[PDB]
């Protein structure tokens, strides 16, 4: 239907298959008209490879010589309506740095837990040494926003929140960053012993506040630029979110910013709302943090449904004394070593994209950008189709990168609507 539309510029807008002869008709029918190829103007969609460095496999002694995605830079010229399929290849290296941050619930019901984690840091680094040479571990603690109605506000219960049992408990605190992740596993053990239990709470707890801060505060936590950013959430109860703090008179939404004071403590646990899952996702993805839910059976199903929405998040069944936390982290790590999922950043609300996952050699999944059950060193190919509905103003920057990895593929998508005869 190019014969009814066509102006050279407007002739190309009515359809991606349309063309102008410097009458608006298809390039095939223009040849029958007698129009020459140099007269036929077609800004056909095309790709221009800029950086296509091959995937580096095997133990690489040089850290700046590791390539886990191919290609890396692509200028994509697209015709309004026309489509283009990109071949993206991703593969994880054998030796890659790993950051672990042990974020733990310090409710009184986690007391029996504390007696078993006392020598985890050394034990964990021992086993993780087999899998990676570069492993740094950190620590953090959370309970709940220290404001009514979440916590009792009587002067005796504020001083000691376990006064009724009675038991010696520290006052309720939102979140306390304690140990920035380092190689010294011996320092980890010393700190676990110094920790004390706070209030005994059978209600959901303010764990979500800690996750936001543990992801955003890059410097104060100490996330390495090219490593796995593992966040181990260890709790035995549910967690408040979003407007749950409306009961406390907290009506100001979380800004997704760092608010650790000089004492390494969440200063805004009485000012900002709990983060929402929509917010947590936006920050965990931006900060490249892989979340691991280590919860008890009474919370597994609940946190299982949370992890479905959060890309790169898994769960694990924790024992009541948490004596299998070592067995959970490593097994969760090995699964991430087998998972390869794609991400798209900075793209458009209006751009439509489709993904097909090509796991192994002869397996092709539709509507999937994630592969599993693959040993380290196996390749993972993806077909990303990009299409622009309208004409737009100018080019827009997009980034395609794997989940958990630092490597990324830059996309410069520039539309074309003008004619060569208009110059």
């Amino acid at each position: 239907g190019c014969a009814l539309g066509g102006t050279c510029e407007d002739c190309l807008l009515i359809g991606p298959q349309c063309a102008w002869c410097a009458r608006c008709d298809t390039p095939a029918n223009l040849l029958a008209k007698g129009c020459q190829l140099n007269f036929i103007e077609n800004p056909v969609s095309q790709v221009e490879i800029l950086k296509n460095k091959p995937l580096s496999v095997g133990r690489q002694k040089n850290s700046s010589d590791i390539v886990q995605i191919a290609p890396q830079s692509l200028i994509l010229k697209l015709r309004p309506g026309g489509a283009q399929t990109l071949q993206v290849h991703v593969r994880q290296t054998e030796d890659y740095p790993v950051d672990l941050y042990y974020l733990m619930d310090l409710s009184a019901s986690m007391d029996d837990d504390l007696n078993t984690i006392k020598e985890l840091g050394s034990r964990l680094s021992k086993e993780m040494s087999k899998l990676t040479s570069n492993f740094r571990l950190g620590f953090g603690s959370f309970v709940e926003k220290p404001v009514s109605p979440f916590v009792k506000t009587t002067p005796e219960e504020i001083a000691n929140p376990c006064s009724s049992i009675p038991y010696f408990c520290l006052p309720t605190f939102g979140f306390k960053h304690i140990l920035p992740l380092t190689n010294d596993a011996e320092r980890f053990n010393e700190i676990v012993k110094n920790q004390k239990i706070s209030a005994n709470i059978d209600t959901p707890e303010g764990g979500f506040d800690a996750i936001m801060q543990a992801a955003v505060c890059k410097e104060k936590i100490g996330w390495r630029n090219d490593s796995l950013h593992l966040l181990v959430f260890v709790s035995d109860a549910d967690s408040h979110f979003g407007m749950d703090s409306k009961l406390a008179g907290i009506v100001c939404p979380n800004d997704g910013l760092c608010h650790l004071d000089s004492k390494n403590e969440y200063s805004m646990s009485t000012v900002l709302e709990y983060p929402t899952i929509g917010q947590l996702i936006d920050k965990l993805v931006q900060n490249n943090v892989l979340l691991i839910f280590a919860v008890t059976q009474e919370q597994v199903h609940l946190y299982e449904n949370y992890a479905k929405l959060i890309p790169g998040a898994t769960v694990g069944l924790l024992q009541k004394d948490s004596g299998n936390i070592l067995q959970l982290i490593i097994s969760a790590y090995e699964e991430l070593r087998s998972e390869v999922e794609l991400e798209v950043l900075g793209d458009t609300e209006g751009l439509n994209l489709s993904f097909t996952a090509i796991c192994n050699n002869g397996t092709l999944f539709q509507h999937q950008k994630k592969c599993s059950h693959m040993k380290v060193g196996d390749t993972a190919s993806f077909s990303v189709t990009v299409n622009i509905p309208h004409c737009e103003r100018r080019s827009r920057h997009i980034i395609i990168k794997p989940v958990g990895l630092g490597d990324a593929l830059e996309l410069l998508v520039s539309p074309e609507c003008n004619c060569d005869c208009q110059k």
């Binding site: 009514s148 749950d244 929509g278 458009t348």
Partner: protein, 591 residues
């Protein structure tokens, strides 16, 4: 689409008091003037030794816009014994929820803490202060003998309140029975009659309340939001409440019978932690005299074209059928992280077309996150999914977001124009804005071109100046307009005509001016028969154009004179949305 954004009424309050956290209308009976009710829950009071007790301001609409604080309670904390406080009115958030019915005003303090008559505790039972014409009492149904968390100690009664059509109060307290939640309903007669300043735990006889349930129902937050409407067809308003943390943070909305507190229907969310039940509303949107359920879930995430989840929020529209079933239709947000569906306020018939309308706000949307309120119109099929008007915030953030639209109230004709108006609260910048509705003009334009089949060799009409006659025809246009409410009986329109609109050589033009265009001012009357003006147009000579194929389109356009047809205050009326301001006919050539 008929809300005036040019010159709205802007009300403000003391900084940090959250002026606009709760807004409502206040209209006493008969001749008495109109007022606005803005709740400032963090406002300083003159109560002895009480910081940020909160207060509700009665804003005046006549002349100046002064708002005088209403005196519900000037007293400080009463004592159980010597040097042993019984209550803690400090930071109680009084004015967090303000509901008004006729002469009655009901404000509440959700964070009102109270000492047990047995041991020295500090439990947020929450309290309320009902105010009649002359009388003023205290209403704290959770402040009872049922103590601690397992009881109604952390009830926070008054967290959400609403009146019924039979003068009955519906109150919600999320924290009752380990945060199962609770709906309590008492007659306004017993609230004032059984009141006793010396009694702290008043027992009501005709009380309707939800009982305690199993431990599996803990952490539900029943009574987070409330609304009223009839749903079993008995005349009595029934109780609708959002239960955001029910079904493992999936969200539910309970409906109890407003007669004996019996379960009728209940909805359930589709997405995890979307806060399904944050805000509920009940209004007949399709004009079938059946209350329709509106449920908000501002944290709802949606899949876009990019295949990426994005928090935009979602409002579910459940149309009530006589069969008893609901026709649920979901409505998603527009901007990311704007939390569309935080506040849902019925507007009544905003445009007076015949169907009630509604407003849904996205408090944290727009440029600089000022705030956006969307207006949706109702129709026979249901709720028109596309908004007809967008209200934008105009104020920047200080430390907390302006929250333009966090709480709003409409369906009350304050200026007596025949059209209900709207109050939008912005506590983040301590403001409250009253938007006035504009009168709607429905205009039925008409255009007749006879004959439409022009004979080029006809040559009937004589042409002044030359002896050569030309082929001619008639152009006839009529204007009729009529509206509802208070609006001028005389309306001035400016009618413009264009012959051969689509085509370049112009093949047809009028006789008197020899020009394709024709301007004519037209003063038509409201509700009268369409006055009509006819004019003669002729076709050009055959030798002046060779285009005999393209049809000659006769185009007419009209626009209302808003300046001269404006209200005494300057409130200009508006033409209807769907009705086109321009129509066109065409003519042919036999060739």
């Amino acid at each position: 689409f008929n809300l005036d954004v040019d010159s709205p009424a802007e009300y403000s309050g003391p900084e940090g008091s959250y002026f606009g956290f709760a807004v409502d209308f206040f209209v006493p009976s008969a001749s008495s003037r109109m007022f606005l009710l803005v709740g400032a829950p963090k406002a300083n009071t003159t109560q002895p030794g009480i910081v940020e007790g909160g207060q509700v301001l009665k804003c005046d609409w006549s002349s100046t816009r002064r708002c005088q604080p209403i005196e519900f309670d000037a007293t400080g904390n009463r004592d159980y014994a010597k040097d042993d406080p019984l209550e803690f009115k400090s930071h109680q958030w009084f004015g967090a929820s303000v509901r008004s019915k006729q002469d009655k005003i009901l404000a509440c303090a959700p964070l009102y803490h109270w000492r047990t008559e047995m041991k020295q505790e500090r439990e947020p039972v929450g309290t309320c202060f009902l105010q009649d014409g002359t009388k003023t009492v205290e209403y704290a149904p959770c402040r009872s003998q049922d103590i601690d968390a397992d009881g109604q100690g952390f009830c926070q009664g008054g967290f959400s309140i609403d009146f019924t059509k039979a003068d009955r109060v519906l109150l919600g307290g999320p924290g009752s029975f380990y945060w199962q939640g609770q709906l309590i309903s008492d007659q306004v007669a017993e609230i004032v009659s059984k009141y006793d300043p010396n009694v702290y735990s008043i027992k009501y006889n005709n009380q309707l309340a939800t009982r305690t349930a199993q431990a599996i129902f803990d952490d539900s937050y029943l009574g987070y939001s409330v609304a009223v409407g009839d749903f079993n067809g008995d005349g009595i308003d029934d109780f609708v409440s959002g239960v955001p943390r029910a079904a493992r943070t999936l969200g539910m909305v309970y409906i109890y019978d407003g007669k004996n507190m019996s379960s009728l229907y209940n909805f359930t969310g589709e997405q995890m932690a979307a806060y399904f039940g944050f805000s509920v509303a009940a209004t007949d949107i399709n004009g079938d005299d059946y209350a329709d359920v509106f449920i908000g879930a501002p944290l709802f995430m949606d899949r876009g074209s990019d295949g990426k989840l994005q928090e935009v929020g979602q409002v579910s529209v459940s149309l009530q059928r006589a069969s008893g079933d609901f026709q649920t239709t979901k409505l998603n947000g527009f901007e990311v992280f704007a939390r569309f569906g935080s506040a849902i306020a019925p507007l009544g018939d905003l445009d007076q077309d015949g169907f009630n309308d509604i407003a849904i706000a996205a408090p944290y949307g727009g440029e600089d996150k000022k705030g956006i309120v969307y207006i949706f119109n109702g129709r026979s099929t249901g709720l028109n999914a596309v908004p007809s008007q967008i209200l934008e915030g105009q104020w920047a953030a200080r430390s907390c977001p302006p929250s333009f639209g966090y709480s709003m109230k409409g369906a009350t004709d304050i200026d007596k124009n025949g059209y209900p108006d709207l109050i939008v609260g912005a506590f983040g910048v301590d403001r409250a804005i009253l938007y006035r509705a504009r009168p709607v003009i429905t205009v039925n334009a008409g255009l007749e071109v006879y004959p439409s089949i022009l004979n080029q060799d006809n040559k009937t009409c004589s042409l002044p100046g030359t002896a050569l006659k030309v082929s001619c025809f008639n152009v006839r246009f009529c204007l009729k307009a009529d509206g509802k409410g208070v609006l001028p009986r005389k309306l001035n329109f400016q009618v413009e005509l264009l012959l051969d609109k689509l085509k370049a050589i112009r093949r047809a033009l009028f006789l008197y001016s020899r020009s394709p265009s024709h301007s004519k001012n037209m003063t038509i009357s409201r509700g009268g028969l369409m006055q009509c003006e006819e004019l003669i147009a002729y076709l050009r000579d055959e030798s002046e154009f060779r285009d005999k194929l393209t049809p000659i389109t006769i185009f007419m356009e009209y626009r209302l004179d808003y300046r001269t047809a404006a209200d005494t205050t300057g409130l200009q009326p508006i033409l209807n949305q769907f009705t086109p301001a321009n129509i066109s006919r065409q003519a042919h050539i036999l060739l």
